[PDB]
């Protein structure tokens, strides 16, 4: 489609020629392989001589550990008036630093007696509440309030229980907090007025009962329509008394009133609970569940309350506003009100709801790493306290500044174990802290760092490196959503506009028909961009300024044309006219947005369909050109494996390594650079017409327009109209408003699309790094390798430079300086987070050392925790299965993954959904992830459920597999078995061979399968909490499609099942349900036995499909100080059968064995702990 341009006209004026002239002005791309070394050596001599004097700065320092520690200590020394805290003071003032932290450690409910045993029995008030809440969801509210009050009175006058009141108020129906006396007066007035109306014989003590009977009759009539009975609710009709009006009109309750404080009052002790136990994570889970449930309340078109029980006592959480936004919460108790009041956010509190044994196991497995040390065995009780405190603090107060504070520790711990580092590093690990909890977090982190990385500890460096590198990945535990949306759109525009005001080129309104001023400005700025000088001048190099010099561009193009950079094997509606500024129907337009990240943020450009069509041509061209060469890893797949092998070898040999990053990659490149580079290359010497079309496309990209967001302009206009009757981004809008017209679009020469022109940037990086390495090898006597991903890079040195680093340090530092300068001379800026060393190597967030391996445990656990959505409950299981399968292959133990699976099953059980044996298997081991797949795990679960019935089936399957692998019967089977009855076929199938048929007592095992006629309805999120709320709301409305055409409930089906005294349920330990259904009642009732499916049929089918996919070992019979750092690499077990596979697929609506090969990808190689490969099962042939 690239050549399609030839169908258009050609209206190119004398503007398209000046750009080519400027890009061809003073560049010499015909030099020879002998005249470049002289220039390189002259530059090196001048630079070295000028640097030895003192007229150029060094930008690099040698690593000294004492200076690094003493600079990390007093990093915030203006507010923290201390130098060395004691751990006892920290543990003391940790449990008293907030209301939420005071509540998690107080001595609440000091006496738990029979009033704590009564909280398991269900009174009548809650039954009536549930019934009326159900009825309401299909004058009025007064009757419901009166019924609730009557139920409460009848519950109190029997066994003296008071659970549903708060002083004088009482939660009645919609979490409301209606008063008491007001209802009495309302009922009095209502009954009086009704009697005065009906008068012109009865009493006020019978009209109420009449209305009660009418209302309950209408309700029970409307509720029996859908199919739900009344026995499910277990309500007692005796709550209504013949004397009910004068029973209500005399009640008397007294207590303590609640309140909310919108601005030493704590009524409990402060430091009861310890830290070694697990008493606070459960309280946190309960409080978080209440805070998330507080988003269900309806708009009502006041006071709302939620309830939770910790240790048999009952607490209430009250609020005064509905919706999903920040509000003020208060915690109350029926003994004394107003325990505390805070200002939390309803979201951001998901990751700790049912996960209290996973976090304890995470801490316990992280601490066992540094346990063999001898310099740490005395103070091994403080590390536990500090780790647990950091975790709990991160979970209780989710902030955006703590995330960056914890993320910045990775670069410190990386620079601590290196040889050289950038001098401007400490100024980067400094973020603005505001509140009083972030300073406490910093002090805890500092105490732990100074405790672990001491000076008299020199035993095991790799374990401590792993430990410290794992405390910095605890920021993934918070969130990646945004606190406020109107501020990030301001920060994004600030980032967009800041670097374009220093260069001095900004166009306000292009008008889509450019004037002469814009063309002259473009020409002038294109000439200014190519006028950078350095190292042969008066001043010298001006670091961190956009531009390229003609000398190095000439050298690069000449060296590419010679053939010095190649390897050994590398040398073998439709518009009609177009100008140099765009098509006839307008220039290219883009819009701005941002993207969510852990840490900062990242811009995003969005275009319409025509520009998306036009950009793909350049993208494909440059991707093909980059594939022709070798060295890039952005889209290739063998290059990444080669890079990993080279990194492993380099680290094993103890050579030098250089891990780099480049800053401001996006907003510093430009399409003019790519144009000027492309115009000076000779490829093979029709194609020149392709080069012309490419130049035209890049010229179109050079004149694009970006649209300013609307909220920012509105905010600026309001701020101006307010302050009139302050930054560089403010004076722009101010001086534009002061003279009328307002800004809407922006155009300039100094920005490429972030995430748009990736592949051309990768190509440019490839060739530039090749040239730089060539020059460096030319000067000295050593060589270098390189691998790029368009903003990341690793460099592996050789033996010569490794020895030169220790024999002549000054020449090594001078070579590093020359590399930095020569790289800056080509529009590439090395970041202050790059390192040179011999202990570790890093590339694409992958770390490699010698003697151990570095798994990122906390990252995977955090990624697995909050990963749920509002989908069908049979697709979330596959997502969790895939995540856990990917995480086991890196070094996470399986006993920590079984707990995550149990957590997911508990999340599903809370929403009142039945659990079938086709969801998860929380009893696996190593061999179920290395050798088998999902189908093998489900087979193992079914074999665990019902043994003594899977042996004969396995023998029949073995004989059938032996008979089918030769071709004796391939059609006698797949035509009158897979399309017949399920139960009356297996008998004759096993009779056909010489095996005992399955017994009549094994064919009753069945399982319940909703969506047996049509898939259940889900659509009728912007956050995970809203996803969980919507999931809990959807399962419970209809979510069922009946046989002909209708909608049902999940409770009606279970009621109908209970209406038959011939079926049995059976539940396992984890909570898996399977039924026993006989074969005589199976007939006669055809309306509700339409949902059950037999088990042995699905078992046979799935087992045969797995035996066809994997080997023939799955049909056999099953049979059944170690330090935490001992790893071993493992590899998995690796037409005419595809028709049989597709046949066996559609006959079982349980799994999708063929989808796993189209959507998902396998794992290449595993690494596992050697202590878990001992305990395992083995299946032979
Ligand atoms: Mg890197
Ligand atoms: Zn009771």
Please give the full DSSP string across 640-693, using - where no structure is assigned: HHHHHHHHHHHHHHT--EEEEEBSS-GGG--HHHHHHHHTT------HHHHHHH
Q: Which residues does 562 contact at the CB level (< 8 Å), separation at least 6?
A: 31, 32, 33
**Bridge partner list, 658:** 795, 836
Question: Measuring CA to CA, which residue among 144, 176, 471, 115 is closest to residue 311?
Answer: 115
Rg value, the chain, Cα: 37
DSSP for residue 589:
E
- 334 and 353 housed in the same domain: no
Last-in-domain residue among 287, 314, 342? 342
Residue 726 lies in a domain: no
- Cα gap 918→937, rounded to integer Å: 10
Residue 1081's alpha-carbon distances to 981, 1004, 1093, 1140, in angstroms, are: 17, 11, 15, 34
- Cα gap 1015→1041, rounded to integer Å: 7
| Residue in the block written with tokens 């990768």 | 762
CB of 538 closer than 8 Å to CB of 549: no
| Known binding positions | 118, 121, 123, 159, 161, 623, 660-662, 791-792, 842
For ligand 1, the distance from its centroid to the CA atom of residue 1075, given in whole angstroms, is: 56
**Bridge partner list, 589:** 705
- 136 and 252 housed in the same domain: yes
- What ligand is nearest to the CA atom of residue 662? 1
- 29 and 178 housed in the same domain: no
Question: Measuring CA to CA, which residue among 869, 1104, 1134, 914 is closest to residue 1009?
Answer: 914
For ligand 1, the distance from its centroid to the CA atom of residue 633, given in whole angstroms, is: 13
For ligand 2, the distance from its centroid to the CA atom of residue 125, given in whole angstroms, is: 9
For ligand 2, the distance from its centroid to the CA atom of residue 128, given in whole angstroms, is: 14
Q: Which residues does 700 contact at the CB level (< 8 Å), separation at least 6?
A: 581, 582, 583, 587, 588, 614
- What ligand is nearest to the CA atom of residue 834? 1
CB of 1100 closer than 8 Å to CB of 959: no
- Cα gap 673→550, rounded to integer Å: 12
- 1082 and 1102 housed in the same domain: yes
Task: Tell me the residue length of the chain.
Answer: 1181
For ligand 2, the distance from its centroid to the CA atom of residue 173, given in whole angstroms, is: 19
Alpha helices in 302-344 (DSSP H): none
For ligand 2, the distance from its centroid to the CA atom of residue 222, given in whole angstroms, is: 30
- Cα gap 357→899, rounded to integer Å: 7
For ligand 1, the distance from its centroid to the CA atom of residue 794, given in whole angstroms, is: 7
- Angle, to 10 degrees, between the axis of helix 934-945 and the axis of helix 1095-1109? 140
For ligand 1, the distance from its centroid to the CA atom of residue 660, given in whole angstroms, is: 5
Q: Which residues does 720 contact at the CB level (< 8 Å), separation at least 6?
A: 733, 734, 737
- 936 and 1040 housed in the same domain: yes
Q: Give the end-to-end CA distance of the chain in Å, rounded to a whole number.
A: 56
| Known binding positions for Mn(2+) | 623, 661-662, 791-792, 842
- What ligand is nearest to the CA atom of residue 159? 2
787, containing H or E segment: strand 787-788
- 523 and 381 housed in the same domain: no
For ligand 2, the distance from its centroid to the CA atom of residue 116, given in whole angstroms, is: 11
For ligand 2, the distance from its centroid to the CA atom of residue 256, given in whole angstroms, is: 21
What the block records as the tokens of 1069 is 């330990």
Half-sphere exposure of 927 (CA within 13 A, CB side): 13
- Domain with 1080, as residue range(s), is 867-1169
Question: Measuring CA to CA, which residue among 384, 404, 493, 504 is closest to residue 444?
Answer: 384
DSSP for residue 637:
S
DSSP for residue 839:
S
- 192 and 238 housed in the same domain: yes
**Bridge partner list, 579:** 582
Residue 512 lies in a domain: yes
- 11 and 122 housed in the same domain: no
What the block records as the tokens of 996 is 């005992």
Residue 138 lies in a domain: yes
Alpha helices in 866-994 (DSSP H): 876-888, 897-910, 927-930, 934-945, 951-964, 971-974, 983-992
- Cα gap 1002→994, rounded to integer Å: 19
Number of domains the chain contains: 4
- Angle, to 10 degrees, between the axis of helix 758-779 and the axis of helix 809-824? 150
For ligand 2, the distance from its centroid to the CA atom of residue 332, given in whole angstroms, is: 20
- Cα gap 743→713, rounded to integer Å: 8
For ligand 1, the distance from its centroid to the CA atom of residue 913, given in whole angstroms, is: 46
Q: Which residues does 327 contact at the CB level (< 8 Å), separation at least 6?
A: 319, 320, 321, 343, 346
Residue 959 lies in a domain: yes
For ligand 1, the distance from its centroid to the CA atom of residue 503, given in whole angstroms, is: 29
- What ligand is nearest to the CA atom of residue 660? 1
- 89 and 153 housed in the same domain: no
For ligand 1, the distance from its centroid to the CA atom of residue 782, given in whole angstroms, is: 23
For ligand 1, the distance from its centroid to the CA atom of residue 655, given in whole angstroms, is: 18
Residue 778 lies in a domain: yes
944: left (phi over 0), alpha (psi -120 to 50) or beta: alpha
Q: Which residues does 788 contact at the CB level (< 8 Å), separation at least 6?
A: 631, 632, 633, 634, 762, 765, 766, 769
- Cα gap 44→1178, rounded to integer Å: 66
- State this model's resolution in angstroms: 3.1
- What ligand is nearest to the CA atom of residue 118? 2
Residue 540 lies in a domain: yes
- 325 and 474 housed in the same domain: no
| Known binding positions for Zn(2+) | 118, 121, 123, 159, 161
| Known binding positions for Mg(2+) | 660-661, 792, 842
For ligand 1, the distance from its centroid to the CA atom of residue 461, given in whole angstroms, is: 22
Question: Measuring CA to CA, which residue among 88, 99, 96 is closest to residue 385?
Answer: 88
Question: Measuring CA to CA, which residue among 541, 530, 424, 419 is closest to residue 822?
Answer: 541
| Residue in the block written with tokens 């009502």 | 300
Beta-sheet pairing, 589-596 with 705-707? parallel
CB of 660 closer than 8 Å to CB of 834: yes
Residue 582 lies in a domain: yes
CB of 826 closer than 8 Å to CB of 556: yes
Q: Is 523 exposed, middle or buried (0-12, 13-18, 19+ CB in 10 A)?
A: middle
Residue 272 lies in a domain: no
Question: Measuring CA to CA, which residue among 293, 352, 479 is closest to residue 403?
Answer: 479
Last-in-domain residue among 773, 805, 824? 824
- 336 and 353 housed in the same domain: no
Q: How was this structure determined?
A: cryo-EM
- 312 and 379 housed in the same domain: no
For ligand 2, the distance from its centroid to the CA atom of residue 207, given in whole angstroms, is: 29
- Cα gap 532→670, rounded to integer Å: 16
- What ligand is nearest to the CA atom of residue 117? 2
| Residue in the block written with tokens 């325990």 | 339
Q: Which residues does 738 contact at the CB level (< 8 Å), separation at least 6?
A: none
- What ligand is nearest to the CA atom of residue 663? 1
For ligand 2, the distance from its centroid to the CA atom of residue 176, given in whole angstroms, is: 21
CB of 876 closer than 8 Å to CB of 868: yes
- Residue 851, Cα to own-chain centre: how many angstroms? 31
Residue-wise burial string across 673-706, b where 16 or more C-beta atoms lie within 10 A, e elsewhere: bbbbbbbbeeeeeeeeeeeebbbbbbbbbbbbbb
CB of 149 closer than 8 Å to CB of 124: no
CB of 775 closer than 8 Å to CB of 822: yes
373: left (phi over 0), alpha (psi -120 to 50) or beta: beta
For ligand 1, the distance from its centroid to the CA atom of residue 362, given in whole angstroms, is: 28
- What ligand is nearest to the CA atom of residue 830? 1
- What ligand is nearest to the CA atom of residue 314? 2
């Amino acid at each position: 489609g690239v050549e399609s341009l030839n169908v258009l006209l050609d209206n190119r004026s004398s503007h398209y020629e000046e750009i080519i002239a400027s890009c061809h002005q003073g560049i010499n791309n015909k030099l020879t392989a002998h005249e470049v070394k002289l220039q390189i050596e002259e530059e090196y001599q001048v630079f070295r001589n000028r640097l030895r004097k003192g007229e150029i700065t060094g930008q690099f320092l040698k690593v000294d550990k004492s200076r690094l520690l003493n600079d990390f200590n007093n990093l915030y020394v203006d507010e923290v008036t201390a130098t060395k805290d004691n751990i006892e003071h920290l543990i003391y003032q940790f449990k008293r630093a907030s209301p939420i932290l005071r509540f998690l450690y107080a001595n609440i409910g000091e006496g738990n007696g029979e009033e704590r045993h009564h909280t398991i029995k269900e009174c009548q008030m809650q039954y009536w509440r549930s019934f009326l809440n159900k009825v309401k969801s299909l004058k009025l509210l007064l009757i419901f309030d009166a019924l609730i009050l009557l139920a409460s009175i009848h519950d109190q006058t029997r066994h003296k229980c008071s659970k549903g009141w708060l002083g004088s108020c009482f939660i009645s129906v919609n979490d409301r907090l209606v008063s008491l006396e007001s209802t009495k007066r309302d009922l009095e007035k209502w009954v009086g007025r009704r009697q005065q109306s009906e008068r012109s014989p009865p009493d006020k003590n019978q009209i109420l009962i009449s209305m009660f009977q009418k209302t309950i009759l209408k309700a029970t009539a409307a509720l029996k329509d859908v199919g739900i009975s009344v026995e499910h609710y277990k309500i007692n009709m005796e709550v209504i008394c013949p004397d009910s009006y004068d029973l209500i009109l005399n009640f008397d309750v007294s207590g303590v009133v609640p309140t909310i404080s919108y601005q030493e009052k704590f009524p409990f002790i402060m430091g009861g609970v310890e830290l070694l136990e697990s008493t606070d994570l459960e309280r946190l889970s309960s409080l978080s569940l209440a805070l998330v449930n507080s988003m269900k309340t309806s708009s009502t078109v006041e006071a709302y309350c939620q309830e939770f029980l910790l240790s048999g006592a009952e607490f209430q959480l009250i609020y005064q506003k509905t919706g999903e936004c920040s509000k003020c919460y208060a915690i109350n108790d029926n003994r004394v009100g107003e325990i505390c009041s805070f200002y939390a956010d309803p979201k951001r509190y998901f990751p700790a709801i049912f996960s209290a044994e996973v976090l304890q196991t995470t801490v316990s497995t992280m601490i066992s790493w540094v346990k063999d040390c001898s310099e740490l065995e005395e103070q091994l009780c403080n590390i536990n306290s500090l780790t647990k405190m950091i975790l709990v603090l991160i979970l209780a107060h989710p902030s955006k500044r703590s995330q960056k504070l914890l993320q910045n520790l990775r670069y410190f711990i990386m620079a601590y174990v290196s040889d050289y580092h950038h001098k401007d590093l400490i100024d980067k690990l400094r973020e603005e802290l505001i509140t009083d909890v972030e300073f406490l977090l910093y002090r805890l982190v500092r105490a732990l760092v100074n405790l672990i990385l001491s000076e008299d500890v020199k035993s095991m460096m790799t374990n401590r490196f792993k430990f410290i590198l794992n405390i910095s990945y605890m920021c993934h535990f918070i969130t990646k959503e945004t606190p406020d949306r109107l501020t990030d759109q301001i920060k994004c525009f600030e980032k967009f506009l800041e670097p374009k005001l220093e260069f001095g080129h900004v166009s306000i309104n292009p008008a889509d028909v450019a004037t002469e001023e814009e063309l002259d400005d473009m020409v002038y700025n294109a000439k200014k961009f190519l006028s950078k000088e350095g190292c042969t001048s008066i001043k010298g190099p001006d670091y961190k300024k956009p531009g390229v010099s003609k000398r190095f561009l000439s050298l690069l193009t000449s060296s590419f044309n010679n053939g010095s950079l190649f390897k050994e094997s590398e040398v073998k509606e439709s518009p009609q006219s177009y100008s140099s500024t765009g098509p006839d129907t307008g220039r290219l337009k883009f819009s701005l947005s941002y993207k969510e990240q852990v840490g900062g943020n990242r811009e995003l450009y969005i275009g319409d369909l025509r520009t998306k069509m036009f950009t793909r041509l350049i993208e494909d061209y440059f991707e093909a050109l980059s594939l022709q060469l070798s060295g890039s890893c952005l889209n290739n797949e063998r290059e990444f494996e080669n890079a990993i092998l080279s990194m492993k070898l380099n680290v094993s040999l103890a050579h030098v390594s250089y891990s780099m990053d480049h800053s401001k990659w996006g907003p510093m490149m430009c399409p003019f650079l790519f144009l000027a580079t492309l115009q000076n290359l000779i490829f093979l010497s029709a194609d020149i017409k392709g080069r012309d079309y490419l130049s035209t496309l890049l010229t179109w990209h050079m004149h694009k327009m970006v649209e300013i967001p609307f909220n920012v302009v509105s905010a600026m206009m309001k701020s101006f109209i307010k302050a009139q009757l302050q930054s560089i981004t403010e004076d722009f809008f101010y001086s534009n408003f002061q003279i009328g017209v307002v800004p809407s679009h922006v155009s300039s020469i100094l920005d490429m699309g972030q995430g748009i022109l990736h592949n051309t940037s990768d190509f440019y990086a490839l060739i530039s790094e090749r040239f730089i390495n060539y020059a460096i090898s030319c000067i000295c006597g050593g060589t270098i390798d390189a691998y790029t991903s368009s903003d990341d890079q690793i460099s592996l040195f050789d033996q010569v430079l490794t020895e030169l680093m220790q024999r002549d340090p000054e020449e090594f530092k001078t070579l590093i300086e020359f590399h930095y300068y020569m790289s800056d001379q080509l529009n590439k800026f090395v970041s202050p987070k790059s390192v040179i060393g011999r202990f570790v190597a890093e590339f694409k967030s992958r770390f490699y050392v010698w003697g151990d391996e570095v798994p990122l445990l906390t990252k995977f656990v955090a990624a697995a925790l909050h990963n749920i959505k509002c989908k069908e409950p049979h697709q979330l299981a596959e997502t969790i299965d895939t995540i856990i399968d990917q995480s086991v292959a890196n070094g996470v133990p399986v006993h920590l993954c079984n707990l995550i699976q149990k957590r997911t099953l508990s999340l599903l059980q809370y929403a009142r959904y039945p659990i079938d044996p086709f969801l998860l298997n929380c009893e696996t081991d190593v061999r179920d992830w290395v050798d088998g797949n999902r189908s093998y795990r489900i087979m193992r679960q079914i074999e665990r459920l019902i043994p003594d019935a899977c042996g004969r089936i396995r023998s029949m399957l073995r004989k059938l597999y032996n008979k089918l692998k030769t071709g004796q019967l391939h059609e006698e089977f797949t035509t009158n078995y897979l399309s017949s009855e399920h139960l009356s076929s297996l008998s004759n199938l096993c009779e056909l061979l010489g095996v005992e048929p399955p017994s009549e007592s094994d064919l009753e095992f069945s399982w319940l399968n909703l969506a047996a006629h049509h898939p259940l309805r889900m659509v009728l999120q912007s956050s995970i909490a809203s996803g969980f709320v919507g999931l809990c709301r959807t399962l419970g409305s209809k979510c069922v499609r009946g046989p002909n055409k209708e909608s049902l409930y999940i409770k009606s089906i279970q009621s109908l099942i209970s209406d038959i005294q011939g079926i049995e349920p059976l539940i396992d330990s984890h909570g898996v349900q399977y039924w026993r259904v006989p074969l005589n009642i199976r007939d006669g009732n055809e309306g509700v036995i339409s949902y059950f499916r037999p088990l042995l049929w699905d078992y046979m089918c799935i087992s045969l499909s797995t035996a066809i996919e994997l080997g023939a070992w799955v049909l056999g019979e099953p049979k059944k100080k170690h330090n935490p750092c001992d790893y071993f690499p493992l590899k998995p077990a690796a037409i005419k059968f595809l028709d049989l596979c597709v046949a066996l697929d559609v006959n079982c609506e349980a799994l999708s064995l063929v989808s796993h090969i189209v959507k998902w990808k396998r794992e290449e190689h595993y690494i596992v702990l050697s202590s878990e490969l001992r305990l395992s099962h083995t299946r032979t042939h």
